[PDB]
Ligand SMILES: *SCC1=CC(C)(C)N(O)C1(C)C
Ligand SMILES: *SCC1=CC(C)(C)N(O)C1(C)C
């Protein structure tokens with residue numbers, strides 16, 4: 499298996515920040531993909547499936563979630579996938595994004611939310627970001 | 633790269649209609665896939681990953697989103713993937729659908745919502761529809 | 767086409783239970799994947815894309831949805847993907863999960879909700895669970 503692949507997950511001990519980690523069980527960062535400055539770096543040109551989920555939580559705002567592309571050539575962030583959700587017992591709100599994109603070598607991808615202080619990663623599998631070359 | 637692929641996005645200037653476009657940056661329509669009468673036409677038999685997202689917006693209904701298959705042989709629409717969501721400051725509501733399906737040559741796929749007048753495509757990456765042969 | 771693949775759907779006649787079926791049109795269970803005791807059994811090691819959607823309905827709770835891995839070696843359930851949603855006319859709430867994972871031969875996957883009595887499968891395409899080897 500030599501396809502570029504990543505499936506990174508939120509650091510559960512970061513406070514007020516969405517920090518992606520690969521060195522967890524059931525996470526991946528293989529075959530050229532790099533995690534640099536919290537972004538995923540594409541090893542080769544091609545079509546990639548790109549996806550991410552966040553979970554928000556509260557008790558008693560507009561919340562969005564975006565995956566953006568930084569082109570190696572044009573050093574400016576373009577949204578590839580984006581969603582917005584409007585929300586004392588607790589409430590939860592997931593958002594999922596995923597699509598296929600042609601990327602070039604060295605592009606960086608970030609999966610970002612506007613209010614990291616609303617994230618819930620109390621349990622595994624709740625907040626994640628991945629790519630696979632197809 | 634010779635895999636059939638499409639990633640089409642809502643026309644932001646259509647009013648009250650979900651019109652899919654490929655001639656945008658970060659959109660795709662390659663290797664046999666066609667966009668005909670707002671539907672995606674499958675070039676060859678095989679397994680395809682199929683997906684789509686819509687974003688709804690309001691201020692101050694049942695809203696659904698479906699991907700359907702028209703078989704070349706049986707000219708009738710079958711839902712492959714479907715979701716329903718129940719919703720003066722603004723509110724937003726995304727819906728995501730995605731799955732793998734065996735399709736035959738010439739099948740048409742549509743990604744449809746019941747109330748296009750509730751869609752929000754004010755910004756890129758909010759409303760999209762894609763397939764990839766796997 | 768020899769890739770392991772499954773796309774299973776909720777049994778619409780089960781009452782208060784999420785029972786996955788493959789013997790429906792537009793469903794799949796091919797090339798080694800097995801459905802045993804309501805779980806999907808992986809035929810070979812490799813990277814798999816794994817996904818599932820549920821739809822909840824009510825009229826007039828915390829609702830979650832998880833895909834878990836049972837390792838053949840370690841017979842304990844780990845959540846791979848999980849989401850929680852907080853909700854007389856009817857209301858509906860979808861949840862979608864999907865990610866790429868390295869699995870080993872004989873692993874079992876389950877897609878589970880905590881309140882099957884809230885599920886809505888009145889129509890096709892609403893509740894589904896699939897994998898594809900990549
Ligand atoms: S999602 C929060 C923020 C406000 C809004 C206009 C809804 N979003 O697009 C951004 C990210 C700018
Ligand atoms: S989603 C809007 C409309 C009504 C309802 C029964 C909820 N949907 O299934 C359709 C598309 C028919």
Ligand SMILES: *SCC1=CC(C)(C)N(O)C1(C)C
Nearest residue numbers: 828829830831849850851880
């Ligand atoms: S989702 C229902 C149930 C309660 C809660 C803590 C929110 N979930 O994690 C479980 C599955 C335990």
